[PDB]
Design a protein around this ligand. Structure first.
Ligand SMILES: [Cl-]
Length: 295
């Protein structure tokens, strides 16, 4: 058992609250633009063991995600006596709802099994990743782990949950992170907004099942207007969406029922998504990604 490699995507809650739990409405999909890579290497004779975390771009480390706990556990459970070099690379900012804790956990578990030479089933990965999230981060995310592992959208509604077929919408989504204090720039009559996104998640499920990009655009714009109608809004965020639309975004909303971990903008084609990115970065957007929606 000498060397093991694992990868994971992130995830986005297109519509629905942050850290959603079963029983609450949501639509989560894989975030293929976000990548976490873990490498576990056995070393020789007598070298020190190391854990190295590489963060790409000017993003902060995810301090709440305690990877040292995952490695300690892995070394003790498997009676590993040899020096290990563990490397984690991440594309994802912390605490923006991009599925960072779950991504690290899925990547780490994959790497672990690959290292031990062990076969890894989906349900086994699901169980081990959910357990690793609990240990490393203090709670699992069932929706994030299932969306990530399956590579399929997961839909929550009322008293049931389903895994849909692979995402296929003929279009693009620009994902914007508004950045930082060290703590993230995230954000009563809010109950009625959450009540309303419930019905919007129901329409989104059918819209996604039938590959209707225009209708998802409608739903995004309805979500946003509903939020703004019912809550005190913020000039700097709205101006960023205004800049995205001025540059070809046909729709916009915040993730997490107005928490705003990400801003999501919908574009018809790749060139327009590249134009949105540049205009929004120029206007201060801290980090951006372009997601092909698979059509
Ligand atoms: Cl969020």
């Amino acid at each position: 058992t000498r060397k093991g490699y694992g990868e994971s995507t992130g995830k986005i809650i297109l519509i629905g609250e942050h850290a959603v739990t079963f029983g609450e409405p949501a639509i989560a999909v894989p975030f293929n633009a976000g990548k976490i890579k873990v490498l576990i290497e056995a070393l020789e004779s007598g070298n020190y063991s190391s854990i190295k975390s590489d963060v790409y771009d000017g993003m902060l480390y995810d301090a709440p995600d305690h990877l040292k706990s995952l490695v300690n556990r892995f070394v003790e459970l498997n009676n590993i006596t040899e020096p290990l070099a563990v490397t984690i690379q991440t594309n994802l900012p912390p605490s923006r709802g991009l599925g960072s804790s779950a991504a690290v956990a899925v990547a780490f578990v994959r790497a672990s099994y690959d290292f031990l030479g062990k076969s890894l089933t989906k349900e086994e990965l699901i169980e081990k990743a959910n357990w690793a999230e609990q240990i490393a981060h203090g709670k699992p995310s069932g929706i994030d782990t299932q969306t990530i592992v399956s590579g399929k959208p997961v839909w929550f509604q009322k008293g049931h949950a389903e895994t849909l077929k692979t995402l296929s919408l003929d279009g693009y989504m620009v994902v914007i992170d508004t950045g930082v204090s060290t703590r993230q720039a995230v954000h009563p009559q809010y109950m009625s907004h959450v009540k309303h996104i419930g019905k919007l998640v129901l329409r989104a499920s059918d819209v996604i099942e039938h590959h209707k990009f225009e209708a998802l655009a409608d739903i995004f714009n309805e979500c946003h207007a509903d939020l703004k109608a019912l809550t005190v809004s913020h000039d700097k965020i709205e101006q960023l969406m205004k800049i995205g639309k001025e540059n070809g975004a046909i729709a916009g909303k915040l993730t997490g029922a107005g928490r705003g971990g990400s801003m999501l903008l919908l574009a018809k084609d790749l060139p327009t998504a590249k134009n949105i990115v540049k205009a929004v970065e120029k206007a201060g957007a801290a980090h951006t990604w372009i997601e092909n929606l698979g059509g």
